[model samples]
Target: MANLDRSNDKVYENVTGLVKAVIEMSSKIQPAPPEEYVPMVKEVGLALRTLLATVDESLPVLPASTHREIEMAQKLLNSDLAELINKMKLAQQYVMTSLQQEYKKQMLTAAHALAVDAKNLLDVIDQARLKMISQSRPHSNLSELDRLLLELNAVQHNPPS
Candidate 1:
């Protein structure tokens, strides 16, 4: 029993340290050379993927509120990119919850919303990148978004939903 307790303590300590380092590094990441910040975002995303993969469905109390707090922190960091990623994760959680209830239609609807949110995020990221290139320039115009809107329109015009 003592050996088991010591091993669990070590595991907890290691996980805590890894999580702290990730969070601290992420907080320090700011608006910077695109080459730098982009890689950091990718790294963070990969870390999140790994962390999530290790989680089991029957685990103890979820930190939903803590995740929401993390989302707010990303917004505070002026990380719209992170916000979009977080929202996508949240939408996935909602879909999972709906699935547990056997609500297939709701899951489909949530997925559509997630898709739209992702497109909007892409547009936002594009505008931010363009602005970085053209200081004092206006935000992305309707013309830039028109192509996507047209695609959406075409989807609606088709026989499928």
Candidate 2:
């Protein structure tokens, strides 16, 4: 029992450390100039992929709150982040093919929009991550209505709920 407890603690520490590292790295990433945007997006994608892998490996040992937090992060990365990266890549290709100012403007706009969305998602993950680290429990302060809404959202995704 003592050894199991120690092992769980070690896993928690490693998972939390990785989460914090991802949050720090995400904070530093921003939409750069058109010339720099694609490379930066690629870099951020790599970092997110690494974090996702770490989270996946740690999920079995993580507390519920930490697991939920990581799951949310995973969902955001697999959906929004993937879409944003795809859009950015397509935009980059368009700009490269044409070199038109209009294409550049559109790319910048798309990048900025995706960046804002990404920041919002990351902020939520950061908050949840910190809360999990501090509380070590799965208790959420969300209202009953909000919980129901989340359940509904989940049901939409999963069905048969």
Candidate 3:
């Protein structure tokens, strides 16, 4: 799947929570007929997509060594990033199926929206942290880790809500 584990967990969680809040807020914009809710979901989804794109664009250009290693690992497994994408897609499919059958419509939709937001935030945080770490010296990943942790701390110390 998506490498959800970034160096900073709190930032990831906070960003995800924000996105979920957006979704939940959208869901409450209207009552009664569920169709009224679809537009809100779509709006939130589009916003999440923009956030996801930002993360994708932020992925660092790997160093030649790291690039080669990534390629070599893919070759050894006889799989590529596209293959990983497909596996993740399948997992999402399974989740959607389960959510549809097992949960209330509004609750499921809210959860899904939150999940998408959280996942997108995770992607961005992971990419940014990875880029920072990759540029560090050996045994110096801690510096990058510290930077991320500090950022997370700042966010916690100054929450939007």
**Highest lDDT model number:** 2
Misplaced by over 4 Å in model 2 are 1-38, 57-62, 97-161
Q: What lDDT does the true structure give each of the candidates?
A: 0.36, 0.46, 0.39
Score candidate 3 by TM-score against the native: 0.33
For model 3, residues 93-122, the per-residue Cα lDDT tens digits are 444355422223333343343444344444
RMSD (Å) of each candidate, 1 decimal: 19.7, 12.3, 12.7
Arrange candidates, best lDDT first: 2, 3, 1
Q: Write the per-residue lDDT of candidate 1 for residues 1-161, one digit (tens) a residue.
A: 43323432332333333344333332332222335544544654553343332222102212222343334433433443355456444434454344322322332233233334323322333444455447754322335334534443343333244
| TM-score for each candidate, following the candidate numbering | 0.26, 0.39, 0.33
- What global local distance difference test value does model 2 have? 0.46
Candidate 2 per-residue lDDT, tens place, 5-47, comes to 4543443344333333233323332333566655666655654
lDDT assessment of candidate 3? 0.39
Indicate whether candidate 1 or candidate 2 has the larger TM-score: 2
- Separately for all candidates shown, the number of backbone clashes (residues 3 or more apart, or on different chains) is 0, 0, 0
Question: Candidate 3: minimum summed lDDT over ten consecutive residues — where?
Answer: 72-81
Better of 1 and 3 by lDDT: 3
